[PDB]
Ligand binder design. Structure first.
Ligand code: AR6
Ligand code: 3AB
Ligand code: CL
Ligand code: ZN
Length: 282
């Protein structure tokens, strides 16, 4: 907890020059069109444009603690709005272009964005979510659950139970939720495309899951400003702001980014909405 291996921190940013970035995002477009089963892996870099610092970016929580400095929040977790990227992922699920979402993020914004929870693996848990020890029932709260470390919150279950409600925030020692990880693992193995967005892929097993797509001919796309553990294993690396990449990608796919109505929870994915017909590729 003090001795924890926090990996490599504050590595330089890479910026793809505009001409190469525009070329690269058209190539991502291409792969999304060709892929039967697209899995997105997210990490803290997709929430930096909403005021949430990352962990190992130039001004990340781990990077600044190393320099003796504080990370800076420009919002509360409660007041944070899903980014363009968050709302791009909503639409990509709605139009059947996204099979599964695997997130390392505890910021709760995927759930609040209105993304369906039966297609989301939250591998490290969710600040707004408590679980019943007795019945395992989950509650999505409008305020962050005040504890971290799978501790008692002080609230009790209301299943037509009085069981102890606890936070879902894994400490260094805790192993990942078996259900979320199982679903994340099967999602990643079966995918023919895994796109990573704003993650450094340094944490096991989260950061290895995208590599599982590379078994049986799957493609891997890494979107990240800094290098990542598995940069070598990517078919495509895009070095740019994830909001820029996704807004260009969406536009290539002929998909608008939907309005965020404020905090909503959707439990269950709907049948795909209509989407434009696919281009001739070859
Ligand atoms: N707008 C942006 N566009 C693109 N890349 C970005 C942006 N902002 C940040 N990045 C990149 O995004 C990356 C963020 O990577 P890391 O900081 O390691 O976050 P994780 O999700 O991978 O952390 C894993 C776990 O470690 C913790 O202990 C927790 O348990 C976490 O769940 C950086 O490389 C930035 O260059
Ligand atoms: N984006 C996130 O999940 C998160 C959560 C806590 C702290 C930080 N820096 C980021
Ligand atoms: Cl913690
Ligand atoms: Zn209960």
């Amino acid at each position: 907890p003090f001795t924890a291996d926090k990996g490599k921190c504050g590595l330089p940013e890479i910026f793809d020059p505009p001409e190469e970035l525009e070329r690269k995002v058209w190539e991502l477009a291409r792969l999304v069109w060709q892929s039967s089963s697209v899995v997105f892996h997210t990490g803290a870099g997709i929430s930096t444009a909403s005021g949430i610092p990352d962990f190992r970016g130039p001004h990340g929580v781990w990077t600044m603690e190393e320099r003796g400095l504080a990370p800076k929040f420009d919002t509360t977790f409660e007041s944070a709005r899903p980014t363009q990227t968050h709302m791009a992922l909503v639409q990509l699920e709605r139009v059947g272009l996204l099979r599964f979402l695997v997130s390392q993020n505890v910021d709760g914004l995927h759930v609040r964005s209105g993304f369906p929870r039966d297609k989301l693996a939250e591998l490290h848990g969710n600040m707004f979510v408590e679980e019943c020890a007795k019945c395992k029932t989950q509650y999505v709260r409008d305020t962050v659950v005040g504890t971290m470390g799978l501790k008692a919150t002080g609230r009790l279950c209301t299943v037509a139970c009085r069981g102890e409600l606890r936070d879902t925030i894994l400490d260094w020692e805790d192993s990942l939720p078996d259900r979320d990880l199982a679903l994340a693992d099967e999602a990643s193995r079966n995918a023919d495309l895994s796109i990573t967005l704003g993650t450094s892929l340094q944490i096991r097993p989260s950061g290895n899951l995208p590599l599982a797509t590379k078994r049986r001919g799957g493609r891997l796309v890494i979107v990240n400003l800094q290098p990542t553990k598995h940069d070598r294993h990517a078919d495509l690396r895009i070095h740019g702001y994830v909001d820029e990449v996704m807004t260009r990608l969406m536009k290539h796919l002929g998909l608008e980014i939907p309005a965020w109505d404020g905090p909503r929870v959707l439990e269950r994915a709907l049948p795909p909405l209509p989407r434009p017909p696919t281009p001739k590729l070859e």
